[PDB]
Structure 1
Amino acid sequence: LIYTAGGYFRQSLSYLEAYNPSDGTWLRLADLQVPRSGLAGCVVGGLLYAVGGRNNSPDGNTDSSALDCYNPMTNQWSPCAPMSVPRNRIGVGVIDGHIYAVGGSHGCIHHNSVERYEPERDEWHLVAPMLTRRIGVGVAVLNRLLYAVGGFDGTNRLNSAECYYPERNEWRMITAMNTIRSGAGVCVLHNCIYAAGGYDGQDQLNSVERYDVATATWTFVAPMKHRRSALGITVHQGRIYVLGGYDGHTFLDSVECYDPDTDTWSEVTRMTSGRSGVGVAVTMEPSR
């Protein structure tokens, strides 16, 4: 199952919905404890983690440092220890069962900080900061290395990408993308880092480009059918899924799937309601 948590459409949502690519169905599950947009989702030990984001309530607007975990066996949410700072429009990646929270904003502060979460101790430790302040950053893990791609620094939208070495504890710059992208969807498929969509300060983008480590190069692939930024992205059974996003006029509910063997995109499903800024991950389906 593909899970989408949170999101945004006129305000921040607490929806938690799971998609079945063979059923067609969307499952409504336990709402997030607090409505949140601009968050990230990941899966460690089967549990679905929802990280950071912001609560845009009609009453107030607060960036979040919260970490919350969802259990598909219990269909229940449980809070974890929070990060050191609120991180809206965050990126996250998993390395050896540890959650890396990357960038994001807190009010006017644009983070370059990065922190690591250890699920076995429910603890958060700060690691080496990034070379760039990046909110709306895409994050991926390839061969146990953490990559931070694109983003916005508060003044400029970025096309650069950097790599973090966990044991070396430092970041080093890599080849920049062909396109400046903030709020793109970044994932790993096979051994290539995919950057899809995003916003370049002027247009929402449908272009997709993938980074090959062996040649240290970003090459363009088949573009999506719909430009979108602040989209959700995940990989399921060797195919990429992008969910939602914002195209400058509407909050999309389109869900596109990319088949790498044919370099093509297809529209498989719509979400129950358009939204952007979701967390998205894949884990076992819940329990009847």
Structure 2
Amino acid sequence: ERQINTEYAVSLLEQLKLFYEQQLFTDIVLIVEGTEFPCHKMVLATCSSYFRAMFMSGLSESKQTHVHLRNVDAATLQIIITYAYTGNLAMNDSTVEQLYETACFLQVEDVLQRCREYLIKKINAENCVRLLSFADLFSCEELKQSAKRMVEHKFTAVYHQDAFMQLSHDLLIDILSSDNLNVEKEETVREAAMLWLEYNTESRSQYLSSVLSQIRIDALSEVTQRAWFQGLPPNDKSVVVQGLYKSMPKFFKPRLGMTKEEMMIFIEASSENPCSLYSSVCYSPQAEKVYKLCSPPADLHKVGTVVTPDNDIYIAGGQVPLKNTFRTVNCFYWFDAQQNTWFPKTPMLFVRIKPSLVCCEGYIYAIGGDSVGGELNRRTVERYDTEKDEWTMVSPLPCAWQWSAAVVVHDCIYVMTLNLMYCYFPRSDSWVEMAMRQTSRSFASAAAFGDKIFYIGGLSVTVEIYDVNKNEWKMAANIPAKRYSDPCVRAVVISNSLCVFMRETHLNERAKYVTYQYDLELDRWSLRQHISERVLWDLGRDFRCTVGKLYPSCLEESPWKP
């Protein structure tokens, strides 16, 4: 289309802003609880879809210059007007609700979409049910769905929210009747439904029937049935009759949250199709199957993994080829446990290469990882806030280390390097010196099993066990591995039992995958399970391992010929 904006549209908007702030050529004024807002009709018509009808339809309000608009806030209307003279919204995190309400009232589509995106990006931990009821009040499919899934995921871990008590029936029915409840047990939703009608027993006995039936026969046991019976308003007979009906019908079926199998997430595997370089797959210890995952960026590699105690997967840093005709990006992502996708989050401030993310006290700690380095100091660390969704700078590393590992034991940060170790106190934000290893080994990782750190491997089969209460390094034994080989060790917790996942490689020989069961007092890796090559193929060298619970139905099996 023939239309420009280079120093002509910006000049026009600046002239309009000058006419507005100087109160020039104004013919309409908005009265908002005594506050006056002189403005123009053209800008209100081009910005809002309600003001065009307010000024076009031949009516008394169209002619009235002193229009008394009510049910609108002064600050929200002021910010909408200034967004209608500058385009700069500049929205905060507190007044988003009233701003979206006034935008829906005035039918201003652009700021509506802006606030919708800002709300869909900021469902962090607490405003979930609140903004869900908000999107139920103002029908918003986008918000509604993201908020629905967000609640299905976190609500089924707290089930004690104050805004949860204040929910409309249809929304509660949609929440409870859905098969997306992230619950490993069926009694938690039962007691949640109970307390939702315990703050309103007697008064709300009408819903005490539908919500009761929604929990289904799995939790409609004779015990709770008779409890509700002896508890109801007096002189209620047909209510007991309709409650007795809910026990045999309505399709008792298993839920989805119970399929929280503790599996083995992997990244940067040997891709099958030669068009792709790496891939992220998974392994099932009990099901003895190999599932796959979608690549978070689909082109960027060299990422770091971390698993919170709430079984959440995150990805930070990494490098992506420039695709000119590997550049480092500080992007961040999060894995969806049901949609099998990756929703990005607030990126980092430094482009890191293979960052080591550690979770502690609800915060994500990214220790080292080439944040970007070119000085004598350089030693730095950036922590993440899972609640406020922001990065906070903390006391930087005491010494600069490369190819290091970091774990968390007893709510404390522990980073391991070639021979040194420092414990970072989250309460005081400082590093304290710890014990030094007698062996200098790098290119290895450590596992935080119980109250002991197990630094395995390094260049080998070095098993150096460290204890926090004792503060000492000791050796246990050597892992049984075939000679003339280079084992790739991986230590991780599984089923509350320390085990390892190692692969041996010889000359003119194929790789073999097998996990062993290690005992504390025996100092021996008993043969737990040998991964058959008929289900799992080669992984590579730069692959990582981490423990986490996943869903088999949401994910897909990795097709590969035995």
Distance 1:70 1:13 in 2: 20
Q: TM-score scaled by structure 2?
A: 0.44
Deviations 1:174-231 (A, max 9, x none): 11123222221111112101111123xxxxx2212111122211111233436456x6
Q: TM-score scaled by structure 1?
A: 0.81
Alignment correspondent of 2:545: 280
Distance 1:246 1:53 in 2: 27
- Of Structure 1 and Structure 2, the greater strand share is in 1
Q: How many residues are paired up?
A: 275
Distance 1:276 1:166 in 2: 34
- Among 175, 179, 197, the residue aligned to 2:435: 175
Is the contact between residue 409 and residue 450 of structure 2 (CA under 8 Å) also seen in structure 1? no
Alignment correspondent of 1:6: 268
Deviations 1:98-147 (A, max 9, x none): 11100112565485211111122321111111111122111011111101
Alignment correspondent of 2:88: none
Q: Which has the larger radius of gyration?
A: 2
- Among 416, 428, 432, the residue aligned to 1:149: 416
> Structure 1 pair 243/4, CA: closer, same or farther in 2 (3 Å)?
farther
Alignment correspondent of 2:294: 30
Residues 1:17 and 2:281 are matched in the alignment:
yes
Matches within 5 A, 1:175-254: 175-199=435-459, 205-224=460-479, 225=481, 227-228=486-487, 232-237=490-495, 238-242=497-501, 254=513
Q: Report the residue type matching 1:33 in the other structure.
A: P
Residues 1:100 and 2:365 are matched in the alignment:
yes
> Structure 1 pair 77/253, CA: closer, same or farther in 2 (3 Å)?
farther
Distance 2:343 2:451 in 1: 33
Distance 1:192 1:93 in 2: 16
Is the contact between residue 102 and residue 112 of structure 1 (CA under 8 Å) also seen in structure 2? no
Residues 1:140 and 2:426 are matched in the alignment:
no
Range moving further from structure 2, 232-241 or 264-273: 264-273
Gaps of 5+ in 1: 151-157, 200-204
Alignment correspondent of 1:153: none
Range moving further from structure 2, 99-108 or 34-43: 34-43
Is the contact between residue 270 and residue 279 of structure 2 (CA under 8 Å) also seen in structure 1? no
Range moving further from structure 2, 12-21 or 174-183: 12-21
Report the Cα offset of residue 36 of structure 1: 4.7
Structure 1 counterpart SS, 2:441: coil
> Structure 1 pair 53/179, CA: closer, same or farther in 2 (3 Å)?
farther
Distance 1:246 1:36 in 2: 28
Alignment correspondent of 1:123: 390
Structure 2 counterpart SS, 1:24: coil
Residues 1:259 and 2:524 are matched in the alignment:
no
Distance 1:8 1:196 in 2: 24
Higher relative contact order (CA 8 A, sep 6+): 1
Deviations 1:220-261 (A, max 9, x none): 1233436456x65421111233466999x9997745444234
Residues 1:268 and 2:530 are matched in the alignment:
yes
Structure 2 counterpart SS, 1:239: strand
Structure 2 counterpart SS, 1:135: coil
Distance 2:360 2:307 in 1: 11
> Structure 1 pair 253/120, CA: closer, same or farther in 2 (3 Å)?
farther
Structure 2 counterpart SS, 1:283: strand
Q: Report the residue type matching 1:50 in the other structure.
A: I
Distance 1:12 1:134 in 2: 32
Distance 2:551 2:498 in 1: 21
> Structure 1 pair 39/12, CA: closer, same or farther in 2 (3 Å)?
farther
Distance 2:347 2:505 in 1: 28
Alignment correspondent of 1:78: 343
Distance 2:276 2:432 in 1: 35
Range moving further from structure 2, 46-55 or 10-19: 10-19
> Structure 1 pair 144/63, CA: closer, same or farther in 2 (3 Å)?
same
Distance 1:179 1:251 in 2: 31
Deviations 1:76-108 (A, max 9, x none): 111122222122233221101211100112565
Matches within 5 A, 1:152-163: 158-163=418-423
Distance 2:409 2:325 in 1: 38
Report the Cα offset of residue 43 of structure 1: 1.7
Distance 2:266 2:552 in 1: 17
Identity %: 21
- Of Structure 1 and Structure 2, the greater helix share is in 2
Distance 2:405 2:368 in 1: 10
Is the contact between residue 89 and residue 136 of structure 1 (CA under 8 Å) also seen in structure 2? no
Distance 1:11 1:187 in 2: 34
Distance 2:469 2:493 in 1: 21
Deviations 1:1-26 (A, max 9, x none): 11012368999954221111122211
Q: Report the residue type matching 2:307 in the other structure.
A: V
Is the contact between residue 270 and residue 278 of structure 2 (CA under 8 Å) also seen in structure 1? no
> Structure 1 pair 20/129, CA: closer, same or farther in 2 (3 Å)?
same
Distance 2:295 2:322 in 1: 15
Distance 2:492 2:306 in 1: 10
